[PDB]
Write a new protein. Structure first.
Lengths: 42, 45
């Protein structure tokens, strides 16, 4: 079962890079909503 | 007396044996291909 999860692990390696670069990009989106007089971020 | 008897004839081709001949050959090559890469069925699981 450890080497049947390898045939699908090519699909998970590229997926976790989209989850890495969408959370980086969301982090620069949160960085610019700070200077927008939003009183949530306090 | 064949017009009152002799059963009813079947137009039967034995392609079910010919379908098994190719399927037994498709299993053989997929095994043979697995050996030449060194990636067995136990390697894929």
């Amino acid at each position: 079962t450890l080497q049947s999860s390898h045939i699908t692990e090519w699909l998970f390696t590229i997926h976790d890079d989209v989850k890495k670069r969408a959370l980086e990009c969301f982090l620069e989106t949160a960085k610019v909503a700070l200077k927008g007089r939003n009183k949530k971020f306090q | 007396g064949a017009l009152n008897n002799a059963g009813k004839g079947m137009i039967e081709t034995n392609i079910g044996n010919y379908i098994q001949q190719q399927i037994n050959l498709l299993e053989f090559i997929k095994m043979e291909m697995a050996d030449v890469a060194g990636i067995s069925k136990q390697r894929e699981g």
